[PDB]
Write an enzyme that holds these catalytic residues in place. Sequence first.
Site, PDB file in Angstrom:
ATOM      1  CG  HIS A   1     180.416 -46.341  51.316  1.00 28.23           C
ATOM      2  ND1 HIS A   1     179.320 -46.381  52.144  1.00 28.23           N
ATOM      3  CD2 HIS A   1     180.262 -45.242  50.544  1.00 28.23           C
ATOM      4  CE1 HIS A   1     178.538 -45.351  51.885  1.00 28.23           C
ATOM      5  NE2 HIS A   1     179.083 -44.651  50.909  1.00 28.23           N
TER       6      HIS A   1
ATOM      7  CG  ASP B   1     179.115 -48.674  54.728  1.00 29.01           C
ATOM      8  OD1 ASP B   1     180.327 -48.371  54.784  1.00 29.01           O
ATOM      9  OD2 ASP B   1     178.304 -48.050  54.007  1.00 29.01           O
TER      10      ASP B   1
ATOM     11  N   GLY C   1     176.585 -38.431  48.340  1.00 33.47           N
ATOM     12  CA  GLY C   1     177.144 -37.324  49.097  1.00 33.47           C
ATOM     13  C   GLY C   1     176.618 -37.180  50.518  1.00 33.47           C
TER      14      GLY C   1
ATOM     15  CB  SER D   1     177.706 -42.080  51.838  1.00 34.58           C
ATOM     16  OG  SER D   1     176.861 -42.757  50.902  1.00 34.58           O
ATOM     17  N   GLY D   2     177.687 -41.783  55.072  1.00 34.30           N
ATOM     18  CA  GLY D   2     178.475 -41.526  56.284  1.00 34.30           C
ATOM     19  C   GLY D   2     177.749 -40.681  57.336  1.00 34.30           C
TER      20      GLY D   2
END
Length: 223
Positions: free
Chosen positions: A40, A84, A175, A177-178
């Site tokens: 995402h 994801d 912020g 995420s990942g």
Amino acid sequence: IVGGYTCGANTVPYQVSLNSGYHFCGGSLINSQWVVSAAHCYKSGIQVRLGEDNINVVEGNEQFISASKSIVHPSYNSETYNNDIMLIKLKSAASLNSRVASISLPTSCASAGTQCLISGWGNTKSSGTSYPDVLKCLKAPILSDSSCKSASSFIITSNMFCAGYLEGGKDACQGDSGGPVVCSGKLQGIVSWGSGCAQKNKPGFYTKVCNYVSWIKQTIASN
Ligand SMILES: COC(=O)[C@H](Cc1cccc(C(=N)N)c1)NC(=O)CNS(=O)(=O)c1ccc(C)cc1
Ligand SMILES: [Ca+2]
């Protein structure tokens, strides 16, 4: 990261910042040429920033390398957030050192109750917003599948796990995420999704990296 602590400069040396003119997602360096992040977080024009603490100040240990290719998982479903996960290849190999270091892929899946390290430059407030310049850290246990199921109105897949605190106040946020979830010294999770941040009974969900090791290894073998 809400309810967490200042990690300390370069204490999490596999943590990357993804920058498209500004920090927008985290990631994890898995070898000198490859970063793992969330699907995402896909966008064009990614610059990977390694050796970061303060993302707004050049402190002397940074490496900024442009992405040459991004590979969103073939079955990524943005509707459900299933799979994801994304791989980002660096235009040139990073110079590995004490402050820029890779994290290993797990050989097994982490167990419920394991304390993991979650990190990023995301929002630090549960209500409203405040974005840190330095890397924040949170220790959080993986929660049982049964407890994760009742802690979301949405349907959870076996490619996801949840971790954190049902009492509230401690969670990943916008912020982050990942970015990495590290347990047993290996990359077990990717910051994926949540309902708000640090809300009572709404823990974070994370991509279960152990399910992706075959695809990652195959993909980096051929790209
Ligand atoms: C984007 O707004 C947010 O504050 C969080 C960010 C976030 C991202 C990853 C992990 C966490 C975490 N808490 N561990 C938080 N996401 C949301 O709040 C999204 N929830 S939501 O209920 O707003 C929502 C639900 C479904 C769709 C399609 C879009 C938005
Ligand atoms: Ca910096």
